């Protein structure tokens, strides 16, 4: 499920198109998971051992990120294709 189903669900998503003209397009290309990491109150990432999750009543979970390509046309094909990494 992690290796195949997640990436396939992402790629099978219809690319979102938005219109007022300004024609915005969104696409999701690549996926990442870090190791199971606990973010403290101050946002300090630390490797979370499962026994901590038992003891501290935390959910033993890993963050998930996606590379997102946003391509905006502006009625005249001046395409700005930005990419956001590890979103």
């Amino acid at each position: 499920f992690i290796q195949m189903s997640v990436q396939r669900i992402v790629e099978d998503a219809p690319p979102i198109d938005l219109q007022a003209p300004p024609r915005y397009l969104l696409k999701f290309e690549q996926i990442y998971l870090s190791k199971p990491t606990h973010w403290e109150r101050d946002g300090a990432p630390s490797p979370m051992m499962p026994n901590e999750a038992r003891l501290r009543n935390l959910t033993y979970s890993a963050p998930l990120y996606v590379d997102i390509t946003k391509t905006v046309i502006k009625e005249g094909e001046e395409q700005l294709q930005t990419q956001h990494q590890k979103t």
Partner: peptide, 16 residues
């Protein structure tokens, strides 16, 4: 296939 990241490539954006 899904790539893996190490903990050092996690920017501190979750704190901001």
């Amino acid at each position: 296939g899904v790539k893996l990241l190490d903990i050092s490539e996690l920017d501190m954006v979750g704190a901001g």
